[PDB]
Write a protein that binds this ligand. Structure first.
Ligand SMILES: [Zn+2]
Ligand SMILES: [Zn+2]
Lengths: 201, 211
């Protein structure tokens, strides 16, 4: 249940049984027999299609709640941190189905995340992370990871989804990515550039 | 089955002398678990013992009742008006959201809904912190004179609501009161030119207003 969510996140290298303890504190043969995952040597654990569905539903539930709460209840990043996951875990599929219709089938959450159709699989429109970029030109911040501290971080440093980012370059030894935002300069660590997606133009 | 559900009970139960027995009945609970709750309600200062009325509600209990109803009615309005919920669908879902959503949610839902002054069942929706005062207090059973009547409010109660829809009684309909019977103990309604007999327990929950 709650673990699969984690297993899909680190999917975007290698998976350890020593890495499972750290992000969740303290399965497997259950996940294996409920056929949600299989074991890989190269990747450690890959989610079966039964998984990725079960999980692409969770992102749908989550991202729709997020749109509703942000667009229509006025919520701010702090408040979504407080309330969002409790009712996310309470609201029925029926609720989510009708919310989808009220909101007129939005394709993205406020943070740039794609909102998979029901019974369908999660395939993000924006996969181009900053870390993984090359050309030093003008870009567009196009998705951010859903997480609080990251959002806080960026909100503090004036980075907003949809805004225009001039990518200055990566320093090979420093380990610092340079940005030009609102006519000013910024230094982002790697782990913070690993969670932020761009698109050229 | 928490303290809020007991207050709501007590609250409408006094729309007379409330007994620990009646509570235990209406709440479907242990007589030992009643005394336990009134101990808390008492101490939490939500009500005081009283000889004529059993328990009276303190302004604090009153304000708490006003929230319960705000929350319940606003959710209701949102579910049906915005999400096309059905009487049945609300019976299965409305309650668990009330036990769950914050008060910010409710304060914002209210803004979204453009501050509706009534849930769809006639039940009025108080401002935040305003004491609850139903617009429609005139129940069918205390309806004196015969004639033409707008059916203005009904209780949410899913059993009662099923009953109403299963007889084409809907809020905002014009209702013809043919009148109480003295021995029959029956209320006669012409509704859509069709006669209908209501018992005392159901007349008690329909609210009307003479048009
Ligand atoms: Zn998101
Ligand atoms: Zn209602």
């Amino acid at each position: 249940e709650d673990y699969l969510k984690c297993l899909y996140e680190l999917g975007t290298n290698k998976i350890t049984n020593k890495e499972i303890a750290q992000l969740m504190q303290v399965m497997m043969k259950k996940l294996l027999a409920e056929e949600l995952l299989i074991k890989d040597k190269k990747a450690g654990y890959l989610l079966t299609d039964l998984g990725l569905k079960l999980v692409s539903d969770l992102y749908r539930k989550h991202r729709l709640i997020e749109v509703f709460l942000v667009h229509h209840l006025g919520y701010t990043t702090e408040e979504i941190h407080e309330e969002a996951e409790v009712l996310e875990h309470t609201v029925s599929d029926h609720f989510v189905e009708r919310l989808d219709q009220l909101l007129d089938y939005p394709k993205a959450c406020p943070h740039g995340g794609t909102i998979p159709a029901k019974g369908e699989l999660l395939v993000e429109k924006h996969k181009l992370t900053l870390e993984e970029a090359k050309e030093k030109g003008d870009y567009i911040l196009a998705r951010v990871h859903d997480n609080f501290d990251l959002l806080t971080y960026l909100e503090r440093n004036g980075l907003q989804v949809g805004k225009t980012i001039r990518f200055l370059g990566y320093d090979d030894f420093s380990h610092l990515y340079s940005l030009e935002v609102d006519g000013q300069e910024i230094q982002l660590a790697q782990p913070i550039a690993q969670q932020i997606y761009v698109e050229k133009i």
